[PDB]
Design a protein around this ligand. Sequence first.
Ligand SMILES: CC(=O)OC[C@]12CC[C@H]3[C@@H](C[C@H]4O[C@]45CCCC(=O)[C@]35C)[C@]1(O)CC[C@@]2(O)[C@@](C)(O)[C@@H]1CC(C)=C(C)C(=O)O1
Ligand SMILES: [Cl-]
Length: 108
Amino acid sequence: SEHLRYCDSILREMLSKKHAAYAWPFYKPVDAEALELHDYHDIIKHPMDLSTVKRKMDGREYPDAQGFAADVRLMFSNCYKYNPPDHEVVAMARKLQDVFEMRFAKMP
Ligand SMILES: CC(=O)OC[C@]12CC[C@H]3[C@@H](C[C@H]4O[C@]45CCCC(=O)[C@]35C)[C@]1(O)CC[C@@]2(O)[C@@](C)(O)[C@@H]1CC(C)=C(C)C(=O)O1
Ligand SMILES: [Cl-]
């Protein structure tokens, strides 16, 4: 759709070097074992990351832009749910979500 191509562009920007500094914790799925997070899958029941979003976007799996946003926001919400609000990862999550929400609001 028209809206989904703009979403594709948002995805490109989120994956670019421009934001890598704060975006990198969301590039690949959360490896709970490598990160020794023994409670991750108790708290987060629907994991989500940027690569999964690329898969769903490249496989034409989103019905419309609103499903795209649902998955992106879900990713962010999971980060906020799991960490306490003074962790730096939450600040990075907020920076990146600022980018996403800005670009999404400015959708033509
Ligand atoms: C990949 C990794 O190093 O993980 C470690 C860590 C995230 C990043 C944090 C790091 C703590 C501080 O060392 C800082 C120093 C400053 C900034 C910083 O980035 C890190 C490396 C962690 O905070 C500890 C555990 C934790 O895994 C989580 C819980 O925050 C998960 C990690 C992930 C990927 C998600 C999506 C989440 O919800 O949160
Ligand atoms: Cl909305």
